[PDB]
Amino acid sequence: XLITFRQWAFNLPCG
């Protein structure tokens, strides 16, 4: 769904 800045910056899965 919505992701945090660090999830965006590091292309981490939303979880």
Added chain:
Amino acid sequence: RATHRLLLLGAGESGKSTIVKQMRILHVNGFNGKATKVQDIKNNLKEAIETIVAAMSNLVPPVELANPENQFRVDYILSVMNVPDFDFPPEFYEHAKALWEDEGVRACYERSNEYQLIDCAQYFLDKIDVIKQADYVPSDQDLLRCRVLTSGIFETKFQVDKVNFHMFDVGGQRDERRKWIQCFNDVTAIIFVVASSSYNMVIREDNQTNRLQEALNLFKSIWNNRWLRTISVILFLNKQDLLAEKVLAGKSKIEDYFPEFARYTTPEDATPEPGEDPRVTRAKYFIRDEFLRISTASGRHYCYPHFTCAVDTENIRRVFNDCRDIIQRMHLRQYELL
């Protein structure tokens, strides 16, 4: 009237919202007109004492109470830890203060980098008796020390010398992956904030990634994003006060977490303040140079580092005056050649 959008970036707890609060003190109405309140200070006090107490059993090696007479105080604190709508009765302040004066609790506080503790812990625990008074009105410094989780964008708009500024922090914001890049639209400069003192801690998100390495990785991602290549970054090496305290205490050596520090020497351009301990100077320039290596390794953007103490209004007034000069003169770099 020119308007400059300033985007605050940085890992959680680096100091972004504190910078906004400082801008409000300096150029708006401070905490006067969803501001931080008395209740948030009491909540931080409770979170600090309950975090330290709960961590005692979980450390390796575990830490015991120095005074087993305080065990019923521990039982009380842990029993109300997650209580919704806590009323903060007088026995809470009694138990918190008496526990804060327990050598075992302090020993656990001294090892706080082994768990997750808010920065203002000692500051608020040391003034329990002031906070519990019914006449207590928090000072601006109390409200600056108070850690409050931002929900949504946290922003301030103000004018200095006929120049409008729009400073916003997106730490409490979430967005669709493909829309996040839009938060940089029409940004004059990124202000990247780093908790310099957090080199011995790990981030809350996974409790594994070192906090400073997280800040370096975030900075690397922003700096090398080709869609942000024209946005200059003002770098706030924040929490200088906590960095100095931690280095001068020798409990956690920087080389234990960043081994190349042992081979790092203070640069010759360094401007150590008079009286600054040489170990502190070498530490704070090392952390600066960890970011500067990233920004030199790869455009039409530059990095402007600054040593800051976000809870020091006078420090931030000085630093922001330098930033306004940097911000109002960034356009001049567009006219330069090579």
